[PDB]
Design an enzyme around this catalytic site. Structure first.
Site, PDB file in Angstrom:
ATOM      1  N   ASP A   1      -9.236 -10.563   8.553  1.00  0.00           N
ATOM      2  CA  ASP A   1      -8.802  -9.204   8.218  1.00  0.00           C
ATOM      3  C   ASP A   1      -9.817  -8.094   8.392  1.00  0.00           C
ATOM      4  OD1 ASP A   1      -6.520  -7.616   7.130  1.00  0.00           O
ATOM      5  OD2 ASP A   1      -7.874  -7.223   5.471  1.00  0.00           O
TER       6      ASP A   1
ATOM      7  N   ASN B   1      -0.095 -18.309  22.017  1.00  0.00           N
ATOM      8  CA  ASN B   1      -1.047 -17.240  22.323  1.00  0.00           C
ATOM      9  C   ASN B   1      -2.374 -17.822  22.811  1.00  0.00           C
ATOM     10  OD1 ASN B   1       0.797 -15.255  21.671  1.00  0.00           O
ATOM     11  ND2 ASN B   1       0.121 -15.094  19.522  1.00  0.00           N
TER      12      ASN B   1
ATOM     13  N   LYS C   1      -9.804  -3.176   1.213  1.00  0.00           N
ATOM     14  CA  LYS C   1      -9.591  -2.008   2.073  1.00  0.00           C
ATOM     15  C   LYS C   1     -10.465  -0.831   1.623  1.00  0.00           C
ATOM     16  CE  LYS C   1      -6.344  -4.132   4.379  1.00  0.00           C
ATOM     17  NZ  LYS C   1      -6.597  -4.648   5.768  1.00  0.00           N
TER      18      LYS C   1
ATOM     19  N   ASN D   1       6.836  -7.993   2.230  1.00  0.00           N
ATOM     20  CA  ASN D   1       5.380  -7.916   2.137  1.00  0.00           C
ATOM     21  C   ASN D   1       4.820  -8.840   1.046  1.00  0.00           C
ATOM     22  OD1 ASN D   1       2.828  -6.770   3.044  1.00  0.00           O
ATOM     23  ND2 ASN D   1       2.745  -5.734   1.045  1.00  0.00           N
TER      24      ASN D   1
ATOM     25  N   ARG E   1       0.844  -1.203   0.000  1.00  0.00           N
ATOM     26  CA  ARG E   1       0.000   0.000   0.000  1.00  0.00           C
ATOM     27  C   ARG E   1       0.873   1.246   0.000  1.00  0.00           C
ATOM     28  NH1 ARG E   1      -1.968   0.781   4.243  1.00  0.00           N
ATOM     29  NH2 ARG E   1      -1.354  -1.069   5.454  1.00  0.00           N
TER      30      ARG E   1
ATOM     31  N   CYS F   1       0.669  -7.351  11.860  1.00  0.00           N
ATOM     32  CA  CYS F   1       0.887  -7.463  13.309  1.00  0.00           C
ATOM     33  C   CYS F   1       0.217  -8.668  13.959  1.00  0.00           C
ATOM     34  CB  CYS F   1       0.493  -6.161  14.013  1.00  0.00           C
ATOM     35  SG  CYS F   1       1.648  -4.822  13.614  1.00  0.00           S
TER      36      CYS F   1
ATOM     37  N   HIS G   1     -10.910  -3.345  10.999  1.00  0.00           N
ATOM     38  CA  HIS G   1      -9.758  -4.116  10.585  1.00  0.00           C
ATOM     39  C   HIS G   1      -9.519  -5.195  11.639  1.00  0.00           C
ATOM     40  CE1 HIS G   1      -5.187  -3.861   9.344  1.00  0.00           C
ATOM     41  NE2 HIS G   1      -5.817  -4.838   8.702  1.00  0.00           N
TER      42      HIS G   1
ATOM     43  N   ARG H   1       2.896 -12.040  -0.383  1.00  0.00           N
ATOM     44  CA  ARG H   1       1.575 -12.485   0.063  1.00  0.00           C
ATOM     45  C   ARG H   1       1.169 -13.787  -0.597  1.00  0.00           C
ATOM     46  NH1 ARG H   1      -1.366  -8.959   3.976  1.00  0.00           N
ATOM     47  NH2 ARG H   1       0.121  -7.206   4.218  1.00  0.00           N
TER      48      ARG H   1
ATOM     49  N   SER I   1      -1.711  -3.642  10.326  1.00  0.00           N
ATOM     50  CA  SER I   1      -1.218  -4.430   9.201  1.00  0.00           C
ATOM     51  C   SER I   1       0.108  -5.117   9.571  1.00  0.00           C
ATOM     52  CB  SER I   1      -1.049  -3.520   7.983  1.00  0.00           C
ATOM     53  OG  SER I   1      -2.207  -2.736   7.744  1.00  0.00           O
TER      54      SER I   1
ATOM     55  N   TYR J   1      -0.844  -3.895  -6.944  1.00  0.00           N
ATOM     56  CA  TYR J   1      -0.729  -4.527  -5.633  1.00  0.00           C
ATOM     57  C   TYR J   1      -2.107  -4.646  -4.990  1.00  0.00           C
ATOM     58  CZ  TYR J   1      -0.053  -5.270  -0.696  1.00  0.00           C
ATOM     59  OH  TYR J   1      -0.119  -5.846   0.545  1.00  0.00           O
ATOM     60  N   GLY J   2      -2.397  -5.798  -4.383  1.00  0.00           N
ATOM     61  CA  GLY J   2      -3.729  -6.147  -3.944  1.00  0.00           C
ATOM     62  C   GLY J   2      -4.394  -5.095  -3.063  1.00  0.00           C
ATOM     63  N   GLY J   3      -3.685  -4.538  -2.096  1.00  0.00           N
ATOM     64  CA  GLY J   3      -4.327  -3.560  -1.214  1.00  0.00           C
ATOM     65  C   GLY J   3      -4.795  -2.298  -1.940  1.00  0.00           C
TER      66      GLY J   3
ATOM     67  N   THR K   1      -3.824 -12.795  10.966  1.00  0.00           N
ATOM     68  CA  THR K   1      -3.957 -14.057  10.228  1.00  0.00           C
ATOM     69  C   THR K   1      -3.431 -15.222  11.067  1.00  0.00           C
ATOM     70  OG1 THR K   1      -4.078 -13.017   8.093  1.00  0.00           O
ATOM     71  CG2 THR K   1      -3.248 -15.268   8.123  1.00  0.00           C
TER      72      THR K   1
ATOM     73  N   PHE L   1       2.514 -17.089  18.463  1.00  0.00           N
ATOM     74  CA  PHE L   1       1.871 -18.078  17.593  1.00  0.00           C
ATOM     75  C   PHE L   1       0.931 -18.982  18.424  1.00  0.00           C
ATOM     76  CE2 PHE L   1       5.853 -16.697  15.661  1.00  0.00           C
ATOM     77  CZ  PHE L   1       5.346 -16.127  14.471  1.00  0.00           C
ATOM     78  N   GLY L   2       1.032 -20.307  18.288  1.00  0.00           N
ATOM     79  CA  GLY L   2       0.108 -21.199  19.007  1.00  0.00           C
ATOM     80  C   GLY L   2       0.121 -21.019  20.523  1.00  0.00           C
TER      81      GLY L   2
HETATM   82  N1  LIG Z   1       6.974 -13.031  16.913  1.00  0.00           N
HETATM   83  C1  LIG Z   1       5.731 -13.183  16.473  1.00  0.00           C
HETATM   84  N2  LIG Z   1       5.477 -12.915  15.140  1.00  0.00           N
HETATM   85  C2  LIG Z   1       4.178 -13.092  14.742  1.00  0.00           C
HETATM   86  C3  LIG Z   1       3.161 -13.485  15.622  1.00  0.00           C
HETATM   87  N3  LIG Z   1       2.017 -13.543  14.893  1.00  0.00           N
HETATM   88  C4  LIG Z   1       2.271 -13.196  13.616  1.00  0.00           C
HETATM   89  N4  LIG Z   1       3.614 -12.934  13.525  1.00  0.00           N
HETATM   90  C5  LIG Z   1       4.338 -12.509  12.330  1.00  0.00           C
HETATM   91  O1  LIG Z   1       3.961 -11.223  11.908  1.00  0.00           O
HETATM   92  C6  LIG Z   1       3.889 -11.156  10.491  1.00  0.00           C
HETATM   93  C7  LIG Z   1       2.480 -10.705  10.101  1.00  0.00           C
HETATM   94  O2  LIG Z   1       1.518 -11.559  10.702  1.00  0.00           O
HETATM   95  P1  LIG Z   1       0.049 -11.693  10.064  1.00  0.00           P
HETATM   96  O3  LIG Z   1      -0.738 -12.597  10.975  1.00  0.00           O
HETATM   97  O4  LIG Z   1       0.118 -12.053   8.617  1.00  0.00           O
HETATM   98  O5  LIG Z   1      -0.433 -10.152  10.199  1.00  0.00           O
HETATM   99  P2  LIG Z   1      -1.880  -9.520   9.839  1.00  0.00           P
HETATM  100  O6  LIG Z   1      -2.319  -8.767  11.061  1.00  0.00           O
HETATM  101  O7  LIG Z   1      -2.778 -10.657   9.388  1.00  0.00           O
HETATM  102  O8  LIG Z   1      -1.510  -8.539   8.634  1.00  0.00           O
HETATM  103  P3  LIG Z   1      -2.403  -7.877   7.433  1.00  0.00           P
HETATM  104  O9  LIG Z   1      -2.843  -9.035   6.590  1.00  0.00           O
HETATM  105  O10 LIG Z   1      -1.353  -7.057   6.756  1.00  0.00           O
HETATM  106  O11 LIG Z   1      -3.562  -7.091   8.009  1.00  0.00           O
HETATM  107  C8  LIG Z   1       4.252 -12.542   9.951  1.00  0.00           C
HETATM  108  O12 LIG Z   1       5.597 -12.533   9.531  1.00  0.00           O
HETATM  109  C9  LIG Z   1       4.071 -13.462  11.141  1.00  0.00           C
HETATM  110  O13 LIG Z   1       4.929 -14.608  11.131  1.00  0.00           O
HETATM  111  C10 LIG Z   1       3.443 -13.770  16.959  1.00  0.00           C
HETATM  112  O14 LIG Z   1       2.616 -14.194  17.782  1.00  0.00           O
HETATM  113  N5  LIG Z   1       4.746 -13.589  17.363  1.00  0.00           N
HETATM  114  O1  LIG Z   2      -2.109  -3.947   4.743  1.00  0.00           O
HETATM  115  C1  LIG Z   2      -3.012  -4.717   5.205  1.00  0.00           C
HETATM  116  O2  LIG Z   2      -3.557  -4.517   6.309  1.00  0.00           O
HETATM  117  C2  LIG Z   2      -3.468  -5.877   4.423  1.00  0.00           C
HETATM  118  O3  LIG Z   2      -3.070  -6.036   3.245  1.00  0.00           O
HETATM  119  O4  LIG Z   2      -4.253  -6.696   4.965  1.00  0.00           O
HETATM  120 MN   LIG Z   3      -3.639 -10.886   7.405  1.00  0.00          MN
HETATM  121 MN   LIG Z   4      -5.067  -5.976   6.881  1.00  0.00          MN
END
Ligand SMILES: Nc1nc2c(ncn2[C@@H]2O[C@H](COP(=O)(O)OP(=O)(O)OP(=O)(O)O)[C@@H](O)[C@H]2O)c(=O)[nH]1
Ligand SMILES: O=C([O-])C(=O)[O-]
Ligand SMILES: [Mn+2]
Ligand SMILES: [Mn+2]
Ligand code: NA
EC number: 4.1.1.32
Length: 621
Positions: free
Chosen positions: A310, A532, A243, A402, A86, A287, A263, A404, A285, A234-236, A290, A529-530
């Protein structure tokens, strides 16, 4: 057939479908924009598998995408390095009055959205669109945001000259003839997209990826129900339902109509007893949404199911439940970091029928990226996202940060049984969070709805690669919506606060998380990750009313021993859960200055009150 010549009839150029088949207003939209953009052909998308196969074949033959031979019907697109994420600085909303779109910052330069006047946009538009599709096909994409035929679904038509956009829209939305049939003579969001490279090309084509970085402009005209995007594939920037529509346009409709467009992921979590709750979470984004939404919990017996990753559309029902639906049909997920260990359910989802953008390719026709955590056989080589040979000991990453995947939600092994339920799922908790390397503990719980809204408003997070921001600059990203507000942020805060005055409302508990706190050496304190799932367990218990919380100035946190840390005996709990008076005095001062400068006259009193209450609690430490 009333005309002195051939009217604006573009029938001669139609190579799929029929203009005669279209609802009157859809036909007008298509033909008016055909007149303007001058495509060589018009393709009315039907959304069929046959069409999709031929589209993929066409792109493969044109060299726009490559087949990944290791997998079932997966594809790779490599972009011009200028068109990779974006661009917030080129994303604008047009309204009669600037203040309706964004507050006026005291100091100059708003960080809650870019406004452009109607006059300036008309000039920008005229400098871009006339003739822009010359030599190309205009695809007509009928799409539904939300399950087909739902009374809450919203339909759009996207015109684009990009077959990459068509393919991605087929995944990310419900598209095709069934959408036109559901639309009938109803209203639809008017979405116009061009890569901005009419033939014959005026500028060199890079990596067979048509784009116009200098004139890139992603515009939203909510008063005309139009989204107009130029210059980026680019998709966004190009998937206009996502978005642009489902956050920017929809957030302003939601304000007018009493609902919310956010979001946020939506997930269902089930404990070992079989009790299930739905949660929503807003993280900025890249963070973690997913990864959370389709987590494989490490705690035995717990299950997470994914409604969406998302975007969430949420509305109170008559019984006071905050109901959420996912308006998307797919996941457009960050690739790097994705592995069997971090997100095994994503790995399963992307095995087939998936389009990858800007990842690396192995010599046996597979995908690669940083953090994939899969060794290759000796002798297997890697082509980077830049179409060059690449080695693990190289300075630059093999995949764009970035990069995807774009994959059908229907393929997720734990897709929730209600992920397409027209009435939505009842939300019992809302989670905010982002990337904070210092000061902010793993999890806390807001003291009230008003405190929770303030927590959303106060969010700050390290910059990521999802847009143009470089370094790890800590930026304000209130509600994870900074790039996506469809209207004045202060009004958005008032709208959230107003939810507390809805008779019978079952207000979700609000939490804030930080997966990303670091020790003195820059290493993560929490594995995430898991793992959490351990934090989700505590939230689940708190929603059930368990006495598992200790009051602190920032909100409730887990009591000693309340979190399940079995298997994480090496986590430094005192550091991870620490709350420093000094840090928080500085934090409240920073938030105060930001709200005063950026929101000022549009700031609701209740937000100012929560700031003062937080400052007061800190003072008693
Ligand atoms: N250290 C750490 N990294 C994480 C964690 N969860 C996600 N990530 C990393 O953060 C990056 C983005 O994570 P996503 O889950 O794709 O983020 P999103 O919020 O879905 O992003 P958008 O699709 O851009 O809205 C990836 O490289 C993940 O591996 C976590 O719990 N700990
Ligand atoms: O940027 C973002 O938040 C996305 O592509 O989901
Ligand atoms: Mn995502
Ligand atoms: Mn997003
Ligand atoms: Na390419």
């Amino acid at each position: 057939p009333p005309q002195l010549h051939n009217g604006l009839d573009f029938s001669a150029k139609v190579i799929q479908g029929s203009l005669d088949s279209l609802p009157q207003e859809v036909r007008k939209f298509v033909e008016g924009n055909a007149q303007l953009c001058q495509p060589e052909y018009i393709h009315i998308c039907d959304g069929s598998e046959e069409e999709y196969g031929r589209l993929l074949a066409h792109m493969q033959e044109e060299g726009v995408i490559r087949k990944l031979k290791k997998y079932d019907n997966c594809w790779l697109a490599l972009t011009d390095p200028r068109d990779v994420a974006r661009i917030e600085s080129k994303t604008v909303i047009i309204t009669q009055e600037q203040r309706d779109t964004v507050p006026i910052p005291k100091s100059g330069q708003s960080q809650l959205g870019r406004w452009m006047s109607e006059e300036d946009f008309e000039k920008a538009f005229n400098a871009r669109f006339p003739g822009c599709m010359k030599g190309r096909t205009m695809y007509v994409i009928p799409f539904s945001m939300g399950p087909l035929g739902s009374p809450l679904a919203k339909i759009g038509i996207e015109l684009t000259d990009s077959p990459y956009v068509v393919a991605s829209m087929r995944i990310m939305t419900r598209m095709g003839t069934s959408v036109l049939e559901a639309l009938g003579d109803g209203e639809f969001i008017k979405c116009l997209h061009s890569v901005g490279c009419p033939l014959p090309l005026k500028k060199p084509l890079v990596n067979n990826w048509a784009c116009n970085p200098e004139l890139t402009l992603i515009a939203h005209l909510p008063d005309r129900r139009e989204i107009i995007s130029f210059g980026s594939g680019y998709g966004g920037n190009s998937l206009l339902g996502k978005k642009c529509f489902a956050l920017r346009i929809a957030s302003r409709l939601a304000k007018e109509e009493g609902w919310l467009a956010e979001h946020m992921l939506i997930l269902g979590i089930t404990n070992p007893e079989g009790k299930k709750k739905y949660l929503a979470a807003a993280f900025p984004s890249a963070c973690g949404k997913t990864n959370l939404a389709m987590m494989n919990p490490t705690l035995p017996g717990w299950k997470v199911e994914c409604v969406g990753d998302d975007i969430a559309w949420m509305k109170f029902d008559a019984q006071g439940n905050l109901r959420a639906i996912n308006p998307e049909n797919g996941f457009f997920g960050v690739a790097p970091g994705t592995s069997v260990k971090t997100n095994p359910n994503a790995i399963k989802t992307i095995q087939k029928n998936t389009i990858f953008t800007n990842v690396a390719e192995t010599s046996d026709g597979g995908v690669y990226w940083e953090g994939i955590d899969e060794p290759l056989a000796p002798g297997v080589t890697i082509t980077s996202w830049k179409n060059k040979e690449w080695r693990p000991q190289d300075e630059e990453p093999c995949a764009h940060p970035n990069s995807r995947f774009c994959t059908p939600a229907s393929q997720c092994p734990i897709i929730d049984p209600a992920w397409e339920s027209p009435e939505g799922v009842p939300i019992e908790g809302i989670i905010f969070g982002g990337r904070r390397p210092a000061g902010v503990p793993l999890v806390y719980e807001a003291l009230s709805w008003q405190h929770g809204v303030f927590v959303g408003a106060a969010m700050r997070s390290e910059a990521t690669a999802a847009a143009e921001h470089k370094g790890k600059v800590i930026m304000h990203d209130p509600f994870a919506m900074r790039p996506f507000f469809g209207y004045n942020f202060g009004k958005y805060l008032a709208h959230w606060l107003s939810m507390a005055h809805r008779p019978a409302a079952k207000l979700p508990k609000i939490f804030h998380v930080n997966w990303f706190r670091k020790d003195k050496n820059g290493k993560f304190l929490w594995p995430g990750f898991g793992e959490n799932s351990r934090v989700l367990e505590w939230m689940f218990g708190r929603i059930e009313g368990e006495d598992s919380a200790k009051l602190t100035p920032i909100g409730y946190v887990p009591k000693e021993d309340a979190l399940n840390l079995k298997g994480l005996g090496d986590v430094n709990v005192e550091e991870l859960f620490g709350i420093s008076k000094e840090f928080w005095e500085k934090e409240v001062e920073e938030i105060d200055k930001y709200l005063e400068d950026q929101v000022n006259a549009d700031l609701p009193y209740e937000i100012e009150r929560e700031l003062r209450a937080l400052k007061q609690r800190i003072s008693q430490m």
